[PDB]
Each structure stands twice: as C-alpha cells, then as structure tokens.
From a paper:
Anti-apoptotic members of the Bcl-2 family are broadly recognized as promising cancer therapeutic targets. Human anti-apoptotic proteins Bcl-2, Bcl-xL, Bcl-w, Mcl-1 and Bfl-1 have a globular, helical fold and function by binding to short, α-helical Bcl-2 homology 3 (BH3) motifs in pro-apoptotic proteins, as shown in Figure 1A. Competition for binding among BH3-containing proteins regulates mitochondrial outer membrane permeabilization (MOMP), which is an irreversible step toward caspase activation and cell death. The role of anti-apoptotic protein Bfl-1 in cancer is less characterized than that of Mcl-1 or Bcl-xL, but many lines of evidence suggest that Bfl-1 is also a critical target. Thus, Bfl-1 is an intriguing therapeutic target and biomarker for resistance to cytotoxic anticancer drugs.
Subsequent rational introduction of an acrylamide moiety to covalently react with Bfl-1 further enhanced Bfl-1 inhibitor specificity. More recent work has shown, as we demonstrate here, that reaction of an electrophilic group on a Bfl-1 inhibitor with a cysteine near the BH3-binding site confers both infinitely tight and covalently selective interactions with Bfl-1 in preference to other Bcl-2 protein family members. Covalent peptide inhibitors had N-terminal acrylamide and C-terminal amidation. Crystals of Bfl-1 in complex with PUMA, FS2 or FS2_1fX peptides were grown in hanging drops over a reservoir containing 1.8 M ammonium sulfate, 0.1 M MES pH 7.0 at room temperature. The PUMA and FS2_1fX complex data sets extended to 1.33 Å and 1.73 Å, respectively, and were phased with the Bfl-1 chain of the FS2 complex model. For example, the structures of FS2 bound to Bfl-1 can be used to design chemical crosslinks to reinforce helicity and promote cellular uptake, the structure of FS2 bound to Mcl-1 can be used to further reduce Mcl-1 binding, and the structure of FS2_1fX can be used as a platform for the design of therapeutic peptides and small molecules that covalently target Bfl-1.
Numbering used by the authors:
A (entry chain A): 0 to 151
B (entry chain B): 1 to 23
Write the structure that this text describes.
C-alpha cells in the first residue's frame, strides 16, 4: 500500500535481506511477498557486483559498524548524486548492504550478534529519506516493485 | 579500487537491472 514507505516496513525489508545473506532467517510465518521477490533480485545483483568489483572490494576493510556506515553513505551519495531514482538502484542498496555484512562477518574487530540490526537501520534511514518520496509516487513496494519484478 | 569505482559500478549494474524489466 501507500504506508509501505514508512520506516518500519523498510527496516524489516533490510533486516530480512541481511538475515537471508547470513543464513539466519527468522522462524514463523516467513518473509512477506515483497521480501521474497526482493531477496532473489537483490542477491542476483550482489553476486554480479562481487564478481565484477572483486579487486576494489577485496581492497576494502569493513572493520566496524561506523566504517560500514561511513562507507555506505559515501558510496550511496555518489551512486545517487545525479538525482535519478529507479527500482534497479533501490535493489543495489540492498545488494550493497549484503556485501557490507559479509565483509563485516570476516573483518569486524569487535563482532557483535546485533550488527546486522544496526546495518539494516541506517540502510532504511537512507532509503526512506532519499528515495521514500519516489517509491510512494511509483506505487510503493506492493504496487510498484513487486508488480515489476515478480514472475510473469 | 575505491568508493568511486564501487558507486558507479553499482549505478551501472542498477540501470541495467532496471532497463531489463522496463518493458
């Protein structure tokens, strides 16, 4: 609906994707249809980015949540600096947080089990504040993203 | 690599993903 651009909904999407990447999906009903569609498309992008930018990424050290947040903000700023927003770019936000959590898992100096909750938080912060208006105007997650990316 | 190659590499992968469902 129109309310799916609120912070709580986006935070759940970002947390769902990191739990997918970390192979710790929460039990119960399971992820929403939006999250189910997103996880497949975002993971496809993540694998391709990891392959194409292996040298640059292998060169990066994500040693803390603060370094993850600063790098995330710096990368997102440049990706979106041209003012263009579309669903493909929104997908790469999730793909990049998946790259970040994987590097943190290996490189975090003081690893903590709630780390992925912090990462997904500032990811939702960026999505809502920088793309929330566009997402709403383009049908939200249910009538926009899922309609375009679900199977035909 | 660096921030730049990563960010604009992400942008390129995005606009491709986007275009490939834009029918």
């Amino acid at each position: 609906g129109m309310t799916d651009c609120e912070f709580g909904y986006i935070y759940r999407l970002a947390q769902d994707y990191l739990q997918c990447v970390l192979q710790i999906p929460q039990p119960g009903s399971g992820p929403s249809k939006t999250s189910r569609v997103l996880q497949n498309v975002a993971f496809s992008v993540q694998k391709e980015v990891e392959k194409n930018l292996k040298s640059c990424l292998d060169n990066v050290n994500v040693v803390s949540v603060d370094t993850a947040r600063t790098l995330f903000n710096q990368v997102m700023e440049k990706e979106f600096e041209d003012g263009i927003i579309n669903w493909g770019r929104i997908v790469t936000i999730f793909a990049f947080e998946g790259i970040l959590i994987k590097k943190l898992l290996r490189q975090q100096i003081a690893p903590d089990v709630d780390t992925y909750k912090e990462i997904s938080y500032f990811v939702a912060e960026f999505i809502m504040n920088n793309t929330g208006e566009w997402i709403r105007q383009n049908g939200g997650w249910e009538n926009g993203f899922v309609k375009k990316f679900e199977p035909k | 690599x660096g921030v730049r190659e990563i960010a604009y590499g992400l942008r390129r992968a995005a606009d491709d993903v986007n275009a490939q469902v834009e029918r």
